[PDB]
Design a binder for these strands. Structure first.
Ligand code: MG
Ligand code: MG
Lengths: 303, 304, 302, 305
DNA sequence: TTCGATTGGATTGTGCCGGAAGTGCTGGCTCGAA
DNA sequence: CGATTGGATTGTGCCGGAAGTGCTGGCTCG
């Protein structure tokens, strides 16, 4: 049975453990540097095996030694209370990286800690894992927002909207209007039929970009959709589903960029990243991609 | 709890009943004119509730009276032939079933499978009196399942991450719209440009899709698992108000320039039945193919 | 599509909304008296429809008006105390008035503690039929018992079956005689020394004190409670007719009337379809009496 | 991704491949000695990955070569009618052949035998394949008890899975139905009998129906394959996902119930290493006698190969 | 001897804890680094 | 000269035509 270690047992970590039990995906270690809290969350969550008809062990840990034998490692831990946080979190990535190198070098790694396109590269470098075995959360979450908003305007099933958002997670994310479909049909056909206007689409783009802030302004925090997105990625690996999912991955010349991680459609299968798909962007799209990657580079230079 | 009546309990009916219990979608009546056989199949299937943790009653019936109170009616009954003399026989069958739906469950959502489906669904529509948004025919979900699958195996992605539209009619004149294929939301043409798959291979896959039933029958098997799964995807989208976009046969009222006939097109299936009929903005060549499919449907409608 | 209203959008509410979308069970209104927060949680949760391939509307509300047309109402609101009767009574009065006015045909699940009192108060003030309102208790408590036993015997957790009756709280009645494993009496595993009588007693104590244990570990128990509640709600919404131990109005069972208590029930499409009275021996009956007496005692303090 | 080889692609095999795709459990090889048909079934079934959102390869095979690297092997192949005890040597022959291949090609596979009489055939395949006793079991109790559980649940109007029951000894007419061990929502059946929700006579009628179910279905011009396939997949899934379900299956007895060197139906725990526990029920005298009779019939047939 | 307390969190805040008030925080404590 | 442990509508080694809730004439393989 797979061993899944959640490095970070905060809000997103907790929902991830709950979903893993629901789906009977594997044993779970809820790790946190904070004492006792993850053991308490783990004890609560373990009882839900009964309701789920599952059998996943869910335990808490405050020791990185429990990374031993992990098949999947999901990193959410890090400071959130700004550029000033960058060296702090770098420190954490170094620490985690060391342990991965020593304890679970064959693990598949998903990084969530923000800014994710920086943090995922730092952990890649410090852990020594292969480029096909480490990715960052970005596109699956962002595009879930876009797909959902469009679906609500057009009154269709959310999953039947497809869309691509690339480059980076965060305010520089590249929303590609040209690549939106509904039930396989170009969005433009629905714009032509006046079911949705270009202005409404732009409003939805802005809302997609601003969604985390919208949720925080309402005195909540985004963790349910992020957790679900991360588990969709992990499951595609663990069950070798080969879903196309937009994640942050090492660029080796794609879009004209190297030595940097960026969001792009990827195929996630049993061996990890099995394909990196490079979209055939036009010049304005490429300029937006360049600006996203430039912001990632700028922040990386500040660690 | 929804009542689902399977009018026809052959091999497709057996798989549909199995899947309904797996998904705990509703009580099932397995109807057939053949005596005792559907009672036997229903008895076998009912025990699988234990393994599924479901609670769907599954019963067999040789009486149309059990259509009473049906929320969903799926019609697979009718004479078959391996892949025109059937048109009058199956017309008479649609008349009989229609009379019973009209009198026993006029509010049911109807899914027609009986071939040639684009003709038979209109005949049942006419003799049942149900509203145009409450009856559809199986076509696109099945055919596109083949297309999506074959492409996905050449590109090494999850089969459902391929999207495709096949329209017009269910049969040899099905319109396969190359322009509308995507993979993980990306136009297929980008994969052709990168030589991940060629134009010629896609042509070969179109031909294989059209001829898949024949391919399976030549291998001494009968296609019924994929058809059953497609039908249950449709029925579930209605029962759970999911509003999936699914290509099915529906009454055309001017779309693509045609009226008074049923044809395959993308539809939204929700709690009120067909909620939207989506007309694709086809170019001239695509429209010519659509025309040919609907013309074949018309040709056959003239032979009942 | 069913409409499910969560009256209370705290941490248990959040997990319930998450699970409802995962299972595509119905549209969800997350209500709370706290402004803006439930709209935020609802927004976050709504996006998970994509990942789940579901289509549930999830919205937030600070208005009881949105109870209108609810098929299921789950009440978790109320003041809490870490491991108030008049306060939460006033809340049950308010909510009850709105259910009576806006959704009198809803199926009601009460979680607000002490649950066996609060469920009766909401029953009285809402006017809903006795077969349409129950309290959370047994499904959660027995999930603890079943889990701990399964981990000592190394079997799938749900293959342990057990009944805990009477009340949800320290006076819960743990029926050792009714525990089975893969359908086999627990006593056979004790005879074979796969588990001891003493270990079973230690597990009973742990089950009773699990909320305290979780709080002592600096966490709040809300995942398993949310899952238990959704199992109950789902049994109603899909007419599954599961046997689930819940708090229900007693009308003579176990020698008691005019009070709610935990007993095995059948939950189906019409609500509580059967109330099953266990054939308890004298000792078990005395424990049941103690649980109910505590519920009555507290009911006198509203 | 696990490799599941279906040795036999008839009615039960077909439904098993359908369910494996529905549950995304693994790649499937539909083997049969009959040419072409399994390739056809596999082609049809493979398209259902789209509707199921799964990604299982489903292929057909007429060669035992494809047992290579199997993680799970499910054996339904064998004679069911004359080309009756006369079938026993024929099927023995088949078990010999399969066994050789398993030994050479997938000795680490988990094996589920369905070919009837299962309690005999499973031991023959055990002997000829050389796999460990914790890696091979026979279908029996999960199916038979699904019948008993279902009929009881319908009389009492509860969820079928909330009825628990144990049927032991052998899969066939000598199956041992244990009234003492029936519970409903975890409550002893006797409480429902005391409450006149169901009578002792009705329970006896249901026991008879449970024993007679296969015949009842055949008499109605059908054949049992949906519930058998579901039962088999429940067993296989408990192995593949390490669920550690308690499931009644046919397993090698080494003294339990007073028998050795024979397979019989008993509650087992199925986990990631195979049979993790064999649970011996503390049967009373009458129950143990019925168990004895079941095992005696298995031995009688085993003596005729 | 002084004085801050992990990348998390219940109702409130938030190193931990009890007592208190009641849609709701802080005064007193231990441990350990500087 | 009977035909793998399977099967569509029917039966059932295979295939094609025929009739129409529905089989068997003609063929070829070792
Ligand atoms: Mg902190
Ligand atoms: Mg044969």
């Amino acid at each position: 049975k797979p061993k899944i270690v959640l490095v970070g047992s905060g809000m997103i970590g907790g929902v991830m453990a709950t979903l893993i039990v629901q789906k009977n995906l594997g044993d779970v270690v809820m790790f946190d540097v904070v004492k006792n809290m993850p053991q308490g969350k783990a004890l609560d969550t373990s009882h839900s095996n009964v309701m789920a008809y599952s059998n996943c062990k869910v335990t808490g840990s405050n020791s990185y030694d429990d990374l031993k034998g992990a098949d999947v490692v999901i990193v959410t831990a890090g400071f959130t209370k700004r550029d000033d946080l960058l060296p702090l979190n770098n420190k954490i990535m170094i620490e985690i990286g060391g342990h991965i190198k020593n304890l679970c070098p064959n693990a598949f790694i998903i990084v969530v800690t923000n800014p994710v396109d920086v943090m995922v590269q730092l952990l890649f470098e410090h852990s020594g894992v292969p480029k096909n075995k480490i990715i960052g959360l970005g596109g699956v979450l962002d595009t879930s927002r876009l797909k959902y908003y469009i679906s609500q305007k057009l009154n269709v099933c959310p999953r039947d909207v497809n869309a691509l958002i690339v480059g980076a997670h965060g305010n520089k994310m590249v929303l590609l209007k040209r690549y939106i479909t509904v039930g396989g049909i170009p969005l433009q056909e629905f714009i032509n039929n006046k079911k949705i206007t270009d202005e409404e689409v732009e409003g939805i783009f802005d809302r997609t970009v601003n969604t985390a802030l919208e949720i925080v302004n309402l005195l909540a925090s985004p963790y349910v959709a992020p957790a679900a997105a991360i588990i969709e990625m992990a499951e595609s690996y663990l069950k070798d589903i080969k879903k196309v999912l937009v994640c942050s991955t090492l660029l080796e010349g794609q879009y004209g960029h190297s030595n940097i991680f960026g969001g792009t459609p990827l195929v996630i299968g049993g061996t990890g990243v099995e394909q990196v798909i490079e979209l055939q962007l036009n010049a304005e799209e490429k300029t937006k991609f360049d600006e996203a990657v430039a912001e990632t580079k700028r922040m990386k230079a500040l660690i």
